[PDB]
């Protein structure tokens, strides 16, 4: 048994009269025949409520602590890809549904964008043979990121589709700190550690990545260029 609380947008939340053994309160609300539940540290009707729609999308309602604003978010079934957000406060509401864009190349690899907004921002994924790179769209520039230890590899794709790659490492020790130089003519990132070249990463015209090590001198390539087949092999190369 609960108490009904008036929310922005003429919506209602039911908050239990008293708390459970943890001192938390149960929340129940009904949005578009879909009924949501949650628990909260407050007894006034604020907190987070969650539910699942008929199309498997994940719904999350956030009621602000002073009850002055509600945020209704719909995610894809992964529970992280934002499809829409409706914010209500001060008698008005703003409902925003992200744009989407999929570029499919001749080899079947893809660039996928979701959450596209008029400010030029979005979420991005590159779907490759064997792995996926994740990142963001910002000012129409795509940046896909792989992190390993203190190293961040960023694959950048311009609005026009020009690919460039950079590496940053926050490592304080130069026994171990990675730096890298991009050669746009060869589409090659050369990694250096402690004044020796260690690896060439080639971003090929086939939308693959190859890795080739340098010799003990740090001057000449040895062995063969090996094609990356999974995300962990990219991380291995950044170690």
UniProtKB/Swiss-Prot annotation:
It is a lipid-anchor. Keywords: Cell outer membrane, Lipoprotein, Membrane, Palmitate, Plasmid, Signal. Changing residue 87 to A: In strain: PBre. InterPro entries: OM_lipoprot_Borrelia, OM_lipoprot_dom_sf. Changing residue 110 to K: In strain: 21343WI. GO terms for cellular component: cell outer membrane; cell surface; membrane. The keyword tRNA-binding does not apply. It holds the Pfam family Lipoprotein_1. It is found in: Cell outer membrane; Cell surface. Induces host (human and mouse) cytokine release by monocyte cell lines via TLR2 and CD14; nonlipidated protein does not stimulate host cells. Belongs to the OspA lipoprotein family. This is Outer surface protein A. The gene is ospA.
């Amino acid at each position: 048994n609960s108490v009904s609380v008036d929310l922005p947008g003429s919506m209602k939340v039911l908050v239990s009269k008293s708390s459970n053994a943890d001192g938390k309160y149960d929340l129940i609300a009904t949005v578009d025949a879909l009924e949501l539940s949650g628990t909260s540290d407050k007894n006034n009707g604020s907190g987070v409520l969650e539910g699942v729609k008929a199309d498997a999308s994940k719904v999350k309602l956030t009621i602000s602590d002073d009850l002055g604003q509600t945020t209704l978010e719909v995610f894809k079934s992964d529970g992280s890809t934002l499809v829409s957000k409706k914010v209500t406060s001060g008698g008005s509401s703003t409902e925003e549904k992200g744009g989407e864009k999929i570029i499919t190349r001749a080899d079947g690899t893809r660039l996928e964008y979701t959450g596209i907004k008029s400010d030029g921002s979005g979420k991005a994924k590159e779907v490759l043979k064997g792995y996926v790179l994740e990142g963001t769209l910002t000012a129409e520039k795509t940046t896909l990121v792989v992190k390993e230890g203190t190293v961040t590899l960023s694959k950048n794709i311009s609005k026009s589709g020009e690919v460039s790659v950079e590496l940053n490492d926050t490592d304080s020790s130069a026994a171990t700190k990675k730096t890298a130089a991009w050669n746009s003519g060869t589409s090659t990132l050369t990694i250096t550690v402690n004044s020796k070249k260690t690896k060439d990463l080639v971003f090929t015209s086939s939308n693959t990545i190859t890795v080739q090590q340098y010799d003990s001198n740090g001057t000449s390539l040895e062995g063969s260029a090996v094609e990356i087949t999974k995300l962990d092999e990219i991380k291995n190369a950044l170690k």
